[PDB]
Write an enzyme that holds these catalytic residues in place. Sequence first.
Site, PDB file in Angstrom:
ATOM      1  N   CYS A  46       0.852  -1.145   0.014  1.00 19.71           N
ATOM      2  CA  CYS A  46       0.060   0.019  -0.104  1.00 19.71           C
ATOM      3  C   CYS A  46       0.945   1.155   0.041  1.00 19.71           C
ATOM      4  O   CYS A  46       2.165   1.292   0.272  1.00 19.71           O
ATOM      5  CB  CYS A  46      -0.920  -0.164   1.069  1.00 19.71           C
ATOM      6  SG  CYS A  46       0.052  -0.367   2.753  1.00 19.71           S
ATOM      7  N   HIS A 101      10.602  14.106   1.801  1.00 21.61           N
ATOM      8  CA  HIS A 101      11.652  14.726   0.973  1.00 21.61           C
ATOM      9  C   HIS A 101      11.027  15.892   0.544  1.00 21.61           C
ATOM     10  O   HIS A 101       9.977  16.377   0.333  1.00 21.61           O
ATOM     11  CB  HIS A 101      11.821  13.648  -0.253  1.00 21.61           C
ATOM     12  CG  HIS A 101      10.366  13.319  -0.837  1.00 21.61           C
ATOM     13  ND1 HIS A 101       9.543  12.294  -0.959  1.00 21.61           N
ATOM     14  CD2 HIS A 101       9.703  13.881  -1.870  1.00 21.61           C
ATOM     15  CE1 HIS A 101       8.549  12.413  -1.406  1.00 21.61           C
ATOM     16  NE2 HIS A 101       8.635  13.298  -2.202  1.00 21.61           N
ATOM     17  N   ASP A 154       5.940  14.370   0.287  1.00 22.04           N
ATOM     18  CA  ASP A 154       6.272  15.393  -0.689  1.00 22.04           C
ATOM     19  C   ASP A 154       6.128  16.722   0.336  1.00 22.04           C
ATOM     20  O   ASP A 154       5.057  17.035   0.580  1.00 22.04           O
ATOM     21  CB  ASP A 154       5.487  15.717  -1.723  1.00 22.04           C
ATOM     22  CG  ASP A 154       5.779  16.774  -2.701  1.00 22.04           C
ATOM     23  OD1 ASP A 154       5.461  17.187  -3.771  1.00 22.04           O
ATOM     24  OD2 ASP A 154       6.545  17.914  -2.112  1.00 22.04           O
ATOM     25  N   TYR A 176      11.595  18.569  -2.785  1.00 23.81           N
ATOM     26  CA  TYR A 176      12.073  18.707  -4.275  1.00 23.81           C
ATOM     27  C   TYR A 176      12.923  19.737  -4.296  1.00 23.81           C
ATOM     28  O   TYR A 176      12.630  20.738  -3.828  1.00 23.81           O
ATOM     29  CB  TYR A 176      10.675  18.793  -5.031  1.00 23.81           C
ATOM     30  CG  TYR A 176      10.078  17.320  -5.509  1.00 23.81           C
ATOM     31  CD1 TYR A 176       9.118  16.956  -4.681  1.00 23.81           C
ATOM     32  CD2 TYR A 176      10.655  16.367  -6.318  1.00 23.81           C
ATOM     33  CE1 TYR A 176       8.741  15.395  -4.931  1.00 23.81           C
ATOM     34  CE2 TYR A 176      10.364  15.142  -6.528  1.00 23.81           C
ATOM     35  CZ  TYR A 176       9.350  14.689  -5.837  1.00 23.81           C
ATOM     36  OH  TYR A 176       8.986  13.105  -6.040  1.00 23.81           O
TER      37      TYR A 176
END
Lengths: 263, 263
Positions: free
Chosen positions: B148, B209, B171, B211
């Site tokens: 999942c 994380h 994110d 970007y």
Amino acid sequence: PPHGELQYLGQIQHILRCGVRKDDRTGTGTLSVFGMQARYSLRDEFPLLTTKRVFWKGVLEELLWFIKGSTNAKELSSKGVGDLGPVYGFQWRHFGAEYRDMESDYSGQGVDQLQRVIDTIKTNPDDRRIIMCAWNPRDLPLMALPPCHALCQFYVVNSELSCQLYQRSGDMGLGVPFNIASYALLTYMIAHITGLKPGDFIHTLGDAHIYLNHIEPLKIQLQREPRPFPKLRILRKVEKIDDFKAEDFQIEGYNPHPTIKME
Amino acid sequence: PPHGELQYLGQIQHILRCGVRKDDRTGTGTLSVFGMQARYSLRDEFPLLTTKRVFWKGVLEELLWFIKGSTNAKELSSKGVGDLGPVYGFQWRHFGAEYRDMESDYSGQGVDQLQRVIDTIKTNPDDRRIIMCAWNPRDLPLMALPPCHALCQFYVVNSELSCQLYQRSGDMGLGVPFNIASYALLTYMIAHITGLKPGDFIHTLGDAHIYLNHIEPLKIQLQREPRPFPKLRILRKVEKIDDFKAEDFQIEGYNPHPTIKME
């Protein structure tokens, strides 16, 4: 930096001081806190708790037993630490396969989550899906598509392998120290066969709880000062996860406080 | 006590300072840290981040869209915020059912994870298995029994409903603030229909994380001081999760810093 074990001791303290009374499945009481996390480095040290002697023998022998895919309790006890049904071993190596008996041959049956994790690591280390799951056998016949009890997510970066264990619930007094060592060991094994260095072991909990009868013994453990973690050595070059043997491992520098019995 | 948003800002800071370079599935770079957790109180306040204006409209409208079980992108865009396949909505209400088309009738097909969560809460609030899972549609055809992407575990004690969201990856710049609000809202809804008070929302991450192209905008967000969280009110007594409408909710006291665009 502070000794890693201080997180565990701190969590125990927090539950004793802020935990809420809550009963488990059998009506047994606990002090509970929902949502917990700790991080233990695996770089040049192994997180085998020292404020009480942890049963390393049982950890190592049980893990090897899981990796074997065995569902025969006799194979584990024979090691000094019997059909048990579809337990972790079976789920780890034959995930999804229908269970029969501890003697049946399940070769090629079900998904080998464990080898898949190892295969994914060596074919795509950046993958965000290096996940392995396990269920409480008890929940299988209970309902359609029951939720898992625990999941392991692996992560690789800079040649270091890390692992995060998420458990639906955690018995802080008895299960947690044992499991910290168990999954830290699994990470060491997997890192070894994949040519990576162990990174971190992250332990995350849903219902983190202390059983009422463990409160007194834990209050005492809290008075103890952690000693530097020992080191885990693998004195043999192993290529397959299935080839590991108890003798391949050696804990060094383990100087624990006395054993503490938890009812 | 410190404002809850300080955890998010602290995590952003930690990733910028200690995060390791790692590429995602498309070779796009990020600064990454494995294993993160934050706790946001839902008691008399709603965790809608203030160091940047969060798209509340999109949060509320998307959640209602998921709860509907819709797999038609047009139904969401029509709300000002088209077969998408087996997306969250379908997985939440028809878990395990084979997907056909956004028009097909899936009544009674698959497991209704959402209603099951609600049913379990009112039939056994102490249960340690009040879990709901969701997959990235993309992974379904990829392999047998794929892992999942996220799971929600609910917890009840002292008439308070808490929720822990574990996401395989997060994110930090774009998805996290939005999801904190999304699942905090879901907890508010579920608590409402079950007569419980919202407790805590715990957000746990695997690969947390940032970007590369978000670094500069985040460094600036970090210079901003959080303002007291707003309150979420449900000005109507609702009995079924399916009956909720956007108008039933009202955010009050939301005084955010200017919008921040993240590429």
